[PDB]
Amino acid sequence: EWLQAEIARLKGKSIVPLQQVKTLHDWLDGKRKARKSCRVVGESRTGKTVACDAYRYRHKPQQEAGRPPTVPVVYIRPHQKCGPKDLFKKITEYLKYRVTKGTVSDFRDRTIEVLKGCGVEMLIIDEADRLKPETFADVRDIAEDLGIAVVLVGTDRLDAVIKRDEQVLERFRAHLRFGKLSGEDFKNTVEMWEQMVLKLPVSSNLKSKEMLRILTSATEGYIGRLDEILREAAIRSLSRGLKKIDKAVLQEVAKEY
Amino acid sequence: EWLQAEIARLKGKSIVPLQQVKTLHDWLDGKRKARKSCRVVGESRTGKTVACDAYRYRHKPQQEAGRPPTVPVVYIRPHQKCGPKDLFKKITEYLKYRVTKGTVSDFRDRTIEVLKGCGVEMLIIDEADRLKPETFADVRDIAEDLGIAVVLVGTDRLDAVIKRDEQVLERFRAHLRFGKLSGEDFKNTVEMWEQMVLKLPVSSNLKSKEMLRILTSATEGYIGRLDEILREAAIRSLSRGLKKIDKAVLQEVAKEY
Amino acid sequence: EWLQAEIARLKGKSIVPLQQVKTLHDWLDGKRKARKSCRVVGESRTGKTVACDAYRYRHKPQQEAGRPPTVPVVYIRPHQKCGPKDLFKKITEYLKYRVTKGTVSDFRDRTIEVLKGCGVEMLIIDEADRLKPETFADVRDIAEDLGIAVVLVGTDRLDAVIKRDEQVLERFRAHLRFGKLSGEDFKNTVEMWEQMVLKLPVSSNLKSKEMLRILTSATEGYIGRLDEILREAAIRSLSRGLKKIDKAVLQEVAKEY
Amino acid sequence: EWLQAEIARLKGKSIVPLQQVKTLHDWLDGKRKARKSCRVVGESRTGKTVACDAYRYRHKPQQEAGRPPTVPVVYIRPHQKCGPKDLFKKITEYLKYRVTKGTVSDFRDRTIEVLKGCGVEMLIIDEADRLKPETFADVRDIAEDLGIAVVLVGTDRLDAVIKRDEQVLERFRAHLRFGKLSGEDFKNTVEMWEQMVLKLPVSSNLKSKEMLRILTSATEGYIGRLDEILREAAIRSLSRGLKKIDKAVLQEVAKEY
Amino acid sequence: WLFLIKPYEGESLSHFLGRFRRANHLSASGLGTLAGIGAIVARWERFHFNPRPSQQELEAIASVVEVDAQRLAQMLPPAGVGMQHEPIRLCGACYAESPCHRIEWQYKSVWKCDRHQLKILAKCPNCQAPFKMPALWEDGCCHRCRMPFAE
DNA sequence: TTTTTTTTTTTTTTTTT
DNA sequence: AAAAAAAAAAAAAAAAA
């Protein structure tokens, strides 16, 4: 069924190139070469996590030799109230090594051992706010003992956590701010969105002012909302037998927010 | 009955040439010439044991005189909680000598006599973790006294056992990291699999993306799972009177995992 | 005495055909042909021991010649904290061989000798959780060395035991989820149970809604409880000189649960 | 074939004079004259056993008189879980006497007879830790009854065994601690190793800093690792048709540790 | 329950029991100990193969523990004739060609193998370790030095 | 929610006459 | 021919903070 094939596609996710994503990638590349540790802070739904995923794929692991693969970058997202056994477990599993039964003092050393040999030039910790304060000692140790940069991506709340520990705050002083979209950048993003993410049989012309003012009020510059508003509107429109998104559909969806 | 002849074949096993096996074979060849003792570590179902069997058949027994066979390589797999009488018994039987009744101190010496005379340049002990710690002394003695290199092939758990004894850990430091399949190597392996392992009257075209995404999700890069998923699907398909594996069969089998 | 003859019958057990039992038998038959390792799990008191017993009955041993009986399927239930000498002893006795005095290693070979010669295509180990972890090595060896598939039937707790050993977990990934009864399947089961299991002089009409709601609340879909509730109610009813089960009896019995 | 002649040589072993070896020989010579029991303890792969072999060859057996061959120093290495019949057997065979069938109480006395007559000034027991605690009584008896000094050479683990018995601990209090290489001693050892141990046609200049930092990281001061790294690199280099070891080869080998 | 070996009428009782163990996956000494445990007669020997109350035991064993009853009693020497008291000598060619020991080797006068016309041997050459097939097996491999016995 | 330790039976083993 | 006797490694448990 054509309709179901398009809905199964639309409900899915993809990465769209944006000025903010390229800016982060070039910035992280500098910190990687310099082995500099620095934070990434911005508002929710601005597309911070997705840009980090795209970076990992930019430089993929290399398997040329029969030796363990040299992973240039490690990306992890700690669970809630993450303790020191959990941080080490997740780093180790990311390198395809299985963790044996033992204590923190046992696979703390195994982590270092897996960290050596594998390149591990940069470690990106998303949801940095989700760490027990005691674990920041093991993060500093890694950043200090070996020449590895630690990104420490976080939301505005992360800064409230960082400032509670002098030694942690001093180390991660440098920062990058994600921001949100406004002005022409938003209009160009909508044009890019209809062309690359929406493939409806008939064009919707979402760049038009009459509907762009609606997308602007509904999204308020958050790439996460623009995604939701247009992705749901496309499924709701096709489900009615339409070949494009009607102004009435954009209004009907916007009213739910 | 044609159907039963194909099922009796499909339920069987065979060795498929792979990049990981050749790599393994020519690394061992270096250690053999240098008489170096090294370990080999890999995850379960990655095809570690099968590559070791293939190596033994690459380097077969040679007899050029009425003297005992010139056995170049010895491969053994110890039983659970293997003690020092059991290790010696299995080495001796492998070389085709009968073990007489006596104590460890009696056929410890008989083992040395039959390790000599035959070349026995290499000893591969699969599943090294299943061994009593006390037996690693008799393994070091062989490796130390005779010009013989010992492989010590095993899973991730073996490293937890090795690190409990300084003298074993230091002697066995060099390692090869057997791994799993990902990317193009997996797609090419599926094409090879359908090309050689499966001889179905009509081609299934398992390399196509619609079914390759299914084999990928079901397999997760483990050659052991790819072998199970496709081998059971072939028998289940033929049993229904099909000449090929239908997408529906691959899905039905994958759902069981 | 008629009353005592019926009580001596009612207190006994029998196998009732059910959709869940046929489903397991067809599934096991596939794994048998493919020689595939599998896993069977479900909740307590739900048609499983009887189903495994019924399967052995379905394909009884063949003894058409002077050679040992051709036993296709072996079913054993290990004792508590079963060790490696006990697993081998019980397999050997099942096949009708006497075990002589000796150690596990000599016993390792006699078990292999009698697993061979007879077909022994399948081994069903009920209550797999009650086994020492060390014994799973001897189970893998059998499954690996011989063309034999091992079912490993058990409860939810078995999964907690299996996940403690990588090499066991990977081998037995395929599973069937035995479940409980609900909806029409339960009503039809009560009608069948009354018809076959109960031969009372006068019909009780247990399918009726007034009493079916009681059997439903008392049973909660567990075939083990439906058999207890109705089997005790039948004996208690006859003992009062009744020719059928009164609603009052079903209520009186249900109150005890 | 020139290449095979060099590989057959390189795969072999030899003794290189070192400051640590001379230090031990002068120290043992003092204990020999004074007949003082003493200990030799150090880390694995530091070259403890080889220095002991060199000492035996320094003072070879002298047979210029009618009486049985006079061996001043006796060197034995006990088997695993060595008992009192095994210790006596190995001492007796070393001195070239055949052991007849009998009990411990029979050739305990024969051992004393052959310890006497020959000078037997010193007994060096390597791998002292792998001995039965009950056997230390027969060792003290020899050390006490006869004018013989016993070395008891071993690793760090030996001290854990010695401290379990008051009477053994006090008797063997004196000790010589083996040490690993660091600083200039390591650089001079690499220069010496290249000149005497390697006969390659073209000089590798391994003393150079660019490659010395690699040998240092790969070796960590253990003479056993320096031996392995350079001995395998020489064979691997010649096998490629090279006349010297390239930096690329030292890096390729180091990556395997 | 033991599986019956291929009968030969000229086989020694000792060999017959050794072949029962080989075929049934245990050691000869292990067979004797196990046989004694099964019977519980208390006079059953591990290595003295031919006793008089053991003839009763053998009859019982023949009639009950085998799939098909084998001739055990026929193999057994009673008092026997010209019986060697010392180690039993053997023919290497005979062991290797037919993995069985002949009853003839147990009796004096027969010093040469009648089939191969070579002298029967009592000790392994060079090793000079006396070689008794009932203790050291039908495989003809010397116990001390595991060298195959030569003529 | 983690960390000792801690105590005990069960055991496989090892030899000795 | 045979057995015993235990040294020692292992495995929850429950207590705090």
Ligand SMILES: Nc1ncnc2c1ncn2[C@@H]1O[C@H](COP(=O)(O)OP(=O)(O)OP(=O)(O)O)[C@@H](O)[C@H]1O
């Ligand atoms: N080279 C190969 N060719 C074909 N099949 C293979 C190969 N290697 C492994 N397999 C598959 O894996 C199974 C054998 O186990 P495998 O060697 O993969 O595990 P392993 O390497 O021994 O790991 P572990 O020792 O942990 O079990 C076979 O059933 C087979 O289908």
Ligand SMILES: Nc1ncnc2c1ncn2[C@@H]1O[C@H](COP(=O)(O)OP(=O)(O)OP(=O)(O)O)[C@@H](O)[C@H]1O
């Ligand atoms: N197919 C059947 N026909 C008749 N009675 C059955 C059937 N299945 C189960 N029962 C009833 O259930 C009881 C046995 O339950 P069963 O052993 O099947 O549960 P189980 O799942 O094996 O329990 P557990 O898994 O906890 O060991 C019997 O007394 C019997 O009356």
Ligand SMILES: Nc1ncnc2c1ncn2[C@@H]1O[C@H](COP(=O)(O)OP(=O)(O)OP(=O)(O)O)[C@@H](O)[C@H]1O
């Ligand atoms: N002077 C030397 N001459 C020869 N080989 C040496 C020397 N120094 C170190 N080695 C190498 O390093 C190793 C050191 O010897 P060995 O391992 O016997 O000492 P060890 O660490 O005391 O041994 P153990 O583990 O028994 O204590 C040898 O195998 C040898 O190849």
Ligand SMILES: [Mg+2]
């Ligand atoms: Mg394997």
Ligand SMILES: [Mg+2]
């Ligand atoms: Mg049950």
Ligand SMILES: [Mg+2]
């Ligand atoms: Mg040494």
